[PDB]
Every structure is written in structure tokens, then in C-alpha cells.
Write a protein that binds this ligand. Structure first.
Ligand SMILES: *[C@@H]1O[C@H](CO)[C@@H](O[C@@H]2O[C@H](CO)[C@@H](O[C@H]3O[C@H](CO)[C@@H](O)[C@H](O)[C@@H]3O)[C@H](O)[C@H]2NC(C)=O)[C@H](O)[C@H]1NC(C)=O
Ligand SMILES: *[C@@H]1O[C@H](CO)[C@@H](O[C@@H]2O[C@H](CO)[C@@H](O[C@H]3O[C@H](CO)[C@@H](O)[C@H](O)[C@@H]3O)[C@H](O)[C@H]2NC(C)=O)[C@H](O)[C@H]1NC(C)=O
Ligand SMILES: *[C@@H]1O[C@H](CO)[C@@H](O[C@@H]2O[C@H](CO)[C@@H](O[C@H]3O[C@H](CO)[C@@H](O)[C@H](O)[C@@H]3O)[C@H](O)[C@H]2NC(C)=O)[C@H](O)[C@H]1NC(C)=O
Ligand SMILES: *[C@@H]1O[C@H](CO)[C@@H](O[C@@H]2O[C@H](CO)[C@@H](O)[C@H](O)[C@H]2NC(C)=O)[C@H](O)[C@H]1NC(C)=O
Ligand SMILES: *[C@@H]1O[C@H](CO)[C@@H](O[C@@H]2O[C@H](CO)[C@@H](O)[C@H](O)[C@H]2NC(C)=O)[C@H](O)[C@H]1NC(C)=O
Ligand SMILES: *[C@@H]1O[C@H](CO)[C@@H](O)[C@H](O)[C@H]1NC(C)=O
Ligand SMILES: *[C@@H]1O[C@H](CO)[C@@H](O)[C@H](O)[C@H]1NC(C)=O
Ligand SMILES: *[C@@H]1O[C@H](CO)[C@@H](O)[C@H](O)[C@H]1NC(C)=O
Ligand SMILES: *[C@@H]1O[C@H](CO)[C@@H](O)[C@H](O)[C@H]1NC(C)=O
Ligand SMILES: *[C@@H]1O[C@H](CO)[C@@H](O)[C@H](O)[C@H]1NC(C)=O
Lengths: 49, 227, 96, 145, 145, 48
């Protein structure tokens, strides 16, 4: 009926709290927000199901 | 990395001096070497490309305490071995002459180190003990790993598990192609004195293994992925 | 009819008490969501052509112009690892 | 037991250091995890093995009625025990600069996380905003007395 | 405040009723800790650069550096050096950083052939005298002598 | 059916020390991967 909800800190997964990695990651724009949104979409659906 | 393949065909050598034949071994990729001999009759090794002073070569000699390692244009003898005997002028036991080589020419590297791999704590009544070594030569660096384990008298090289810890490392900076091992013959003056020396050799190969670390962080099992 | 039903419910308890894998359709969902996160955390070890996968090694050993071409490989590969995980989870979520 | 930047033999990083239960073999300097990152180290001055654990962290979620309905909000520290929010007080530096929620007085432990700025009430209602683990939150007048 | 954090997370000046995931909190490092081995003598490598004569390149001389403080700056201030070319490290980091085994390979070269000391090159020095790996970690230093 | 996490509180005392050597959930959590709890508890589903 459902599966485990998951949330990801995109920033912490890609960059291990490096600030210069985080400043490079901003060159890629909205992809981290798209991932977060998509996972939030999946997670909210498990309760709906 | 570079391992002894599982269930692989190892050579088992018996050597004996017989009181009143032993051609040089190849050394390709690296060597697993193992022995179970009592009374320290097996000591050390030669490794080299030519062994006759035309090019540099490696010598390792153990004795009753500490090791010497030397890298040199040695002219080795066709039978290199170590003698230790009672010298009456010193009233004690030591080596007479370095009958492993006819000459040592201009050597390039000289090294000395801790004894390693003694017999059991206070010895025991012929319950046995296996000593195991790995010798590897990569990027001009010569790496030594070893272990020993007590073994009950089923048979030597028993089924079970134990991994070799690294023990010594040295950048000999030379080609290796062949090798030999030094016996300690007892040579009791009243002349010579016979003794046997059993040892196993098994060359390693470039291989992938899956290693099972237990919660203590020791390799308690492995799979040879090409067996 | 009651005795047949009462014995048929009895066989459900016996079947669920004896057999290992009858709930495989639910355990497979747990196993796939666990395998996917273990896979995603494995891809942190991957170098993607950088000198190390460990971000702190690069920042211990390089300076702020040649470090960046290492860090950018790791960003590129890790961002692809998340885009793969999230696509696989969006596809799984449609099956669920 | 405190969050620090560390450097062991050039191995820079950030974490809390702790007495490990790990029996390193004498030839080993570093111990490592499934993500290929160092999680234990042998101190080079006194030969003891330290666990490294990353300094405490978590997701944050903000619970709001409509902005046209109110400007007041509640904050969920997701996956956090509320006894660790007394460590998340801005006495040392934290990522969220808005310390004011940390004033508490109405702090509540949900199994989803520590929930702050929302008062827990016994009388159940339909789920308005879902917090998780059976808890929901709503904006309304509470005047039972 | 946490409402303003949602407004920037949503890029909207009005936020409708809901629960919104925002920037993850982290406890920051309280202080900086360094642990190197408490060995004290300055490295003997100055005695190689100041030698009466260097090795010939067909027999290039390799020296172990061990158990010592590698303060490279006072060495770079002992003699003018024409090159520095570090490959696996940046020269600025060499103070903050520790080493497992350090070997100086030392010899004399015509200025033309210094071009072949770079990793993976080809030419008489690199082909037959002295081949460092195409992936070696270290620095090449040279000066007209 | 035996679960790998259910999204409930880990008090950080759970995560440090020995458990990170034996439970993968910690490696996951220390890399920003979080299992969230369901809105209805198993008691709340048993009621329905
Ligand atoms: C095992 O064999 C080793 C040699 O293969 C041997 O090492 C040698 O030990 C002696 C005594 O310590 C040293 O002799 C020198 O001692 C001082 C040095 O200042 C001088 O008074 C002497 O005249 C002499 O030069 C040797 O130098 C040393 N050889 C090496 C290569 O270091 C071990 O002692 C042997 N072990 C046992 C238990 O006998
Ligand atoms: C990993 O290393 C551990 C430490 O050496 C080891 O734990 C030790 O295990 C032995 C054998 O079970 C215990 O020996 C005692 O066992 C019982 C009492 O618990 C008695 O009947 C015995 O006579 C004996 O006193 C040690 O006490 C125990 N040590 C500790 C600190 O727990 C683990 O077993 C090792 N891991 C593996 C996989 O074996
Ligand atoms: C329709 O199917 C029924 C089975 O689902 C069947 O009921 C079974 O009938 C037999 C007897 O014919 C019973 O067997 C027992 O009978 C007595 C004890 O009561 C003993 O002498 C026997 O050794 C044996 O224990 C079954 O217990 C009974 N099963 C159930 C669930 O009641 C009907 O007889 C069938 N009817 C027709 C018309 O075919
Ligand atoms: C070790 O062996 C011999 C003898 O010491 C050395 O050969 C001599 O080398 C010098 C210097 O190049 C020449 O002047 C002689 O003419 C050489 N003698 C012969 C007979 O050829 C050899 O160079 C030494 N090697 C090392 C590494 O020291
Ligand atoms: C939040 O963390 C604290 C510890 O910081 C937990 O308190 C412990 O709880 C157990 C069980 O009741 C007691 O045996 C301990 O003595 C308590 N320790 C302290 C220092 O008070 C608390 O239970 C945790 N809460 C949740 C919801 O997990
Ligand atoms: C090992 O190889 C030799 C040939 O080199 C062969 O005579 C011997 O029987 C082999 N033994 C096994 C167990 O394969
Ligand atoms: C620091 O150096 C001194 C002098 O050699 C030594 O006694 C001490 O043991 C060293 N410190 C530690 C923690 O070992
Ligand atoms: C906000 O609430 C008021 C009533 O308080 C309502 O009239 C208005 O239409 C609402 N606006 C929005 C954007 O929800
Ligand atoms: C809920 O009711 C109990 C008495 O049944 C009371 O002790 C408790 O204080 C109430 N909860 C709150 C949040 O006050
Ligand atoms: C080089 O070493 C000698 C001692 O052998 C010393 O006198 C000299 O001062 C050193 N060179 C410099 C530039 O200090």
C-alpha cells in the first residue's frame, strides 16, 4: 500500500559540509530543489495511499 | 590485488644436508612461503635477477635475535647456507664465515631490524605451529607480510582461516626474478651434523577477493572470485 | 458452514506461523528501498575521475583553483547518483 | 564529546571525538566506513583510538497557517530528541541564525521530531496539517476554560 | 525568522497553509584541534642540497627522510631554487600536512632534460636513467649548479 | 515483515560509538538520507 518515505539533504549528500563545494554546487541551479520536490511528492503520496 | 589463489597447487619441499640438487627457485609476481619446522632450521632468503654480482640483488638473514637485510652485487654460492657452532675461543655459539657469497661488491642499501616470528611462548611437547609469509615486489618496493598459528596434528596447511599482517617494507629499487632460502645446519665440533628442513612455496597471482571482516575488524573469511 | 470457516481460519494461522516468505510482496518493498539507500551511500566512495572520493583530502592537499576541478567531478557524479535514485523512486512510487 | 574542527596527521575534518571500543592492529592509523570516509583515528601523541562522529544536525520543517491568516509558525526539528535542542541553542554558532524559537516554553516531543511553537492538546480533531506519527497541527482559538 | 526562510525557499511573499521543509540545521565547530606526532628535530634534508657533489643520473641517489619536522621554508631560504612543480599537493598546504614515507631522489641534469622529469614524459633520462611514475605524488625542485 | 528503520527518534546516543559499526542506517543518516515516519501509526491503522 505504501513504501518508506525518504527525504534527502542534497547539499549534505553531495558536499560533506564543505563551503567551497556548496559554492560550486550553486553553479548547477535548481536540480537540488527538483530532487527535494520530487521526493516530497513521493513522500506525501504514501500517506494518501 | 595479488594473492595465493584458493585451493592452488603449492610445491612442498624437503631439504636435508645428510652429513658425510637444490637449484634456485623462480620469483614471479610474489611468493607465499610457509614452514612448520622445529628448532629454527629455516632462516632467511635471497631474492634477485642474476645472483652472480653482474647486477644488484637482495639478501635477508635472520638469527637468534634481529635481522639484517642488504642490497648488493653479491656473488652467491650455488648452495647458500648458514652455519652456527660452538667456538672454543669464545666458549659460546655463533657463525664462522659468510659462506652465502664468495664476494660482496659495492652495495647500495643496508638495513637492520627487530627479530620477528619466534617459536611459542615457553615452547610445548611437539604440538605444532605453522609460520606463513608473503613476499611481494611492486613499483620497486618489497613488501613483507606474515603470521604464525598453533596447529593440532591433523595436517599442516589445515582448513580454517587466518590472515597475514604486514611486518616489513623496503624500497630495494631493483628487479627480482628468482629466489632461495637459508638453512641453519648445526655442524657440532667433537665436524658436520645432519638436519631436515620442510617448507612450502606458492606463487601469488593478480586476483580479486571478497574479504569478511568480523566486528573485531579481522579477516575471518574470504571468497576467491575466480575459483 | 461455521465449522468449515473456523477450520479455514485455523489453517491461515498455521500457514502464517510455519512458512518463511509468504509476505514476500511486502518484504520485497522494504528490501528494495533499503538496497536503494545502501547503493546511494555506496556511490559516495566512487572517485568519478577525481584524485580522491574524500572531499576533505582534496581540501587538505589542493588550493582554490585546481581543487575545484576535482570537487566538480564529485559534484557531477554525486548529482547523477541522486538523479538516478530519485528517478528509480518516482518509478517505484508509481507501482506502489 | 564536543564539536570541533580536527586535523590528525593532515586529515582535516569536523566532528565530535569519543573513546572508541575499536581494537586497531598496530600498523593501522585510520578506520573507515561503507561511504569510504574516516570514522576512527589513532591519536599520534597518546596511542589511543578515537571514534569520530559528525556534529549533530537534522532537517527542519516550518508549520504555518496561511500568511494572510497569521505570521506565527511552529518549527519541527525532524528526527531530533528535544533534549538535544538545549544543545541546538545558539550559545555556540548554528546554521539557522533565528535563535528565537529556541526560547521554547511550549516544546513537545513527537516521534517525527522535536516540535516547537505549537501547544499539545489532549482533545483530538481531524488532521489539518500533518506532522507525522499520528500528530497533526492546526491554527485555532483554544479556550476550553 | 523561520517564516522568512520559507518565503525564500518557496520564492513567494505569501505562503499558504502547510508544513514546508527548509534548510537543515547543523551545530558548528566550537574550536580547532590539531594532533601531529610530538617529534621535534628539523629534517636532515639540508645536508643533501648542500653536498660537495651530487649523484650521476645513471645511478641516481635515493635518501629516506624519517622521524623529523619538514619545515621546507628555511630550506627554500637557504638556496635560490629555479623550480618547485608539486603534482599531488599544492605548495601552500605543505605546512598543514603529514607524510608516511618520504624519499628524496637526487641527481644532476642538463637544463634541456629537466622537461623529461614531468610525469609520463619520454627522452633519454626518462627512458633509461630515472623513471618516476605517471601518477607519482610529490614535488620536483631544481636549480642551476 | 522486518523493517530497516521506521523514521522514529534516534537520540544521537544511538548513532555514535558502537552502533555506527553495525547498523547501516547511521551511515545513511550521516550522509543526509532520512527515512520519514508515516502519518498513521500501526495502532492507528489497526483501529481503521
Ligand atoms: C645476528 O646477526 C647480526 C649480524 O648479521 C648481528 O648484528 C651485529 O651485532 C654486533 C654486536 O652488537 C655488531 O658489532 C659491532 O658492535 C660495536 C659497534 O659500535 C663495535 O664495538 C664492534 O666492534 C662491532 O663493530 C655488528 O655491527 C652488528 N651487525 C650489524 C649488521 O648491525 C646480531 O648481533 C646477531 N644477533 C645475535 C643474537 O647474535
Ligand atoms: C572480539 O574480541 C573480544 C575481546 O577479546 C572477544 O570477547 C571475549 O570472548 C571470550 C570468549 O567468549 C570471553 O571469554 C570468557 O567467556 C565466558 C564469560 O563471558 C567464560 O565462560 C570464559 O571462561 C571466559 O572468561 C571474553 O571474556 C570476551 N571478552 C570481552 C571483553 O567481552 C570476542 O568474542 C571477539 N569476537 C569474536 C567474533 O569472537
Ligand atoms: C459435506 O462435506 C463435509 C466436509 O466438509 C462433510 O462433513 C464431514 O462428515 C464426516 C462424516 O461423514 C465427519 O467425519 C467424522 O464423523 C464422526 C465424528 O463426528 C466419526 O465417526 C468419523 O470418524 C469422523 O471423525 C466430518 O467430521 C465432517 N466434517 C465437518 C467439517 O463437519 C459432510 O458429511 C458432507 N455432506 C454430504 C451430504 O456429502
Ligand atoms: C663497484 O665495483 C667497481 C670496483 O670498485 C667499480 O668499478 C670502477 O668504477 C670507477 C668509477 O666509475 C672506474 O674508475 C673504474 O675503472 C671501475 N673499475 C672497473 C674494473 O671497471 C664500480 O663502479 C663500483 N660500483 C659502485 C656503485 O660503487
Ligand atoms: C531523549 O534523550 C535523553 C538523553 O539525553 C533520554 O533520557 C534518558 O532516558 C532513559 C529512559 O527513560 C533513562 O534511563 C536515562 O536515565 C535518561 N537519561 C538522561 C540523561 O536523562 C530521553 O529518554 C530521550 N527521549 C526520547 C523521546 O527518546
Ligand atoms: C601440481 O602440479 C604438478 C605439475 O607441475 C602435478 O604433477 C601435480 O600432480 C599437481 N597436483 C595437484 C593437486 O594438482
Ligand atoms: C612529548 O615528548 C616528550 C619528550 O620526548 C615525551 O616524554 C612525551 O611522552 C610526548 N608526549 C606524549 C603524549 O607522548
Ligand atoms: C486571506 O484571508 C482573508 C480573510 O481573513 C480573505 O478575505 C482573503 O481572500 C485571503 N487571501 C488569501 C490570498 O488567501
Ligand atoms: C491530558 O490529560 C491528562 C489527564 O488525563 C493530564 O494529566 C495532562 O496534563 C493532559 N495533557 C496536557 C498537554 O496538559
Ligand atoms: C654547507 O655545509 C658546510 C659544512 O659542511 C657549511 O660550512 C656551510 O655553511 C653550508 N652552506 C651554507 C650556505 O650555509
Amino acid at each position: 500500500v505504501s513504501m518508506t518515505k525518504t527525504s534527502v539533504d542534497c547539499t549534505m549528500y553531495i558536499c560533506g559540509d564543505s563551503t567551497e563545494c556548496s559554492n560550486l554546487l550553486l553553479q548547477y541551479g535548481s536540480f537540488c530543489t527538483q530532487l527535494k520536490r520530487a521526493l516530497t511528492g513521493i513522500a506525501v503520496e504514501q500517506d494518501k495511499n | 590485488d595479488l594473492f595465493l589463489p584458493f585451493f592452488s597447487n603449492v610445491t612442498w619441499f624437503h631439504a636435508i644436508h645428510v652429513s658425510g640438487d637444490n637449484p634456485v627457485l623462480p620469483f614471479n609476481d610474489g611468493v607465499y612461503f610457509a614452514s612448520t619446522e622445529k628448532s629454527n632450521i629455516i632462516r632467511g632468503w635471497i631474492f634477485g635477477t642474476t645472483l652472480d654480482s653482474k647486477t644488484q640483488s637482495l639478501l635477508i638473514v635472520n638469527n637468534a635475535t634481529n635481522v639484517v637485510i642488504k642490497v648488493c652485487e653479491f656473488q652467491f654460492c650455488n648452495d647458500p647456507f648458514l652455519d652456527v657452532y660452538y667456538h672454543k675461543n669464545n666458549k659460546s655459539w655463533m657463525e664462522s664465515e659468510f659462506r652465502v657469497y664468495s664476494s660482496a661488491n659495492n652495495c647500495t642499501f643496508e638495513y637492520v631490524s627487530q627479530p620477528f616470528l619466534m617459536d611459542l611462548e615457553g615452547k610445548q611437547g611437539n604440538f605444532k605451529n605453522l609460520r606463513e609469509f608473503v613476499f611481494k615486489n611492486i613499483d620497486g618496493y618489497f613488501k613483507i607480510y606474515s603470521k604464525h598459528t598453533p596447529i593440532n596434528l591433523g595436517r599442516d596447511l589445515p582448513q580454517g582461516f587466518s590472515a597475514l599482517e604486514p611486518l616489513v617494507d623496503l624500497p630495494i629499487g631493483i628487479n627480482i626474478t628468482r629466489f632461495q632460502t637459508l638453512l641453519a645446519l648445526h655442524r657440532s665440533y667433537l665436524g658436520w651434523t645432519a638436519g631436515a628442513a620442510a617448507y612450502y612455496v606458492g606463487y601469488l597471482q593478480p586476483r580479486t577477493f571478497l574479504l569478511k571482516y568480523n566486528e573485531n575488524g579481522t579477516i575471518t573469511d574470504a571468497v576467491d572470485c575466480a575459483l | 458452514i461455521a465449522n468449515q470457516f473456523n477450520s479455514a481460519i485455523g489453517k491461515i494461522q498455521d500457514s502464517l506461523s510455519s512458512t518463511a516468505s509468504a509476505l514476500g510482496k511486502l518484504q520485497d518493498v522494504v528490501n528494495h528501498n533499503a538496497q536503494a539507500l545502501n547503493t546511494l551511500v555506496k556511490q559516495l566512495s566512487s572517485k568519478f575521475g577525481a584524485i580522491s572520493s574524500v572531499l576533505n583530502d582534496i581540501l587538505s592537499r589542493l588550493d582554490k583553483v585546481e581543487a575545484e576541478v576535482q570537487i566538480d567531478r564529485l559534484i557531477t557524479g554525486r548529482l547523477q547518483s541522486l538523479q538516478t535514485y530519485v528517478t528509480q523512486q518516482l518509478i517505484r512510487a508509481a507501482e506502489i | 564529546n564536543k564539536c570541533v574542527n580536527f586535523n590528525f596527521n593532515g586529515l582535516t575534518g569536523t566532528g565530535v571525538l569519543t573513546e572508541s571500543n575499536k581494537k586497531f592492529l598496530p600498523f593501522q592509523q585510520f578506520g573507515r566506513d561503507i561511504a569510504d570516509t574516516t570514522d576512527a583515528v589513532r591519536d599520534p601523541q597518546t596511542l589511543e583510538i578515537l571514534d569520530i562522529t559528525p556534529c549533530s544536525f537534522g532537517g527542519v520543517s516550518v508549520i504555518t497557517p496561511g500568511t494572510n491568516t497569521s505570521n506565527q509558525v511552529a518549527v519541527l526539528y525532524q528526527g531530533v530528541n528535544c533534549t538535544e535542542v538545549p544543545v541546538a541553542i545558539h550559545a555556540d554558532q548554528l546554521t539557522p541564525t533565528w535563535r528565537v524559537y529556541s526560547t521554547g516554553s511550549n516544546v513537545f516531543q513527537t516521534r517525527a521530531g522535536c516540535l516547537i511553537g505549537a501547544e499539545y492538546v489532549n482533545n483530538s480533531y481531524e488532521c489539518d496539517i500533518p506532522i507525522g506519527a499520528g500528530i497533526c497541527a492546526s491554527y485555532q482559538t483554544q479556550t476550553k476554560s | 525568522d523561520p517564516l522568512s526562510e520559507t518565503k525564500c525557499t518557496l520564492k513567494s511573499f505569501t505562503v499558504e497553509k502547510g508544513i514546508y521543509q527548509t534548510s537543515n540545521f547543523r551545530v558548528q565547530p566550537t574550536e580547532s584541534i590539531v594532533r601531529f606526532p610530538n617529534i621535534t628535530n628539523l629534517c636532515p634534508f639540508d645536508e643533501v642540497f648542500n653536498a660537495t657533489r651530487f649523484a650521476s643520473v645513471y645511478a641516481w641517489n635515493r635518501k629516506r627522510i624519517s622521524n623529523c619536522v619538514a619545515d621546507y621554508s628555511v630550506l627554500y631560504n637557504f638556496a635560490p631554487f629555479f623550480a618547485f612543480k608539486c603534482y599531488g599537493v599544492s605548495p601552500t598546504k605543505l605546512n598543514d600536512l603529514c607524510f608516511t614515507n618520504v624519499y628524496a631522489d637526487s641527481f644532476v641534469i642538463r637544463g634541456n632534460e629537466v622537461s623529461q622529469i614531468a610525469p609520463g614524459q619520454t627522452g633519454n633520462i626518462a627512458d633509461y636513467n630515472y623513471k618516476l611514475p605517471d601518477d607519482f605524488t610529490g614535488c620536483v625542485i631544481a636549480w642551476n649548479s | 515483515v522486518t523493517l530497516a528503520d521506521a523514521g522514529f527518534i534516534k537520540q544521537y546516543g544511538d548513532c555514535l560509538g558502537d552502533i555506527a559499526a553495525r547498523d547501516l542506517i547511521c551511515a545513511q543518516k550521516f550522509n543526509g538520507l532520512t527515512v520519514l515516519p508515516p502519518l498513521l501509526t500501526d495502532e492507528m491503522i489497526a483501529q481503521y
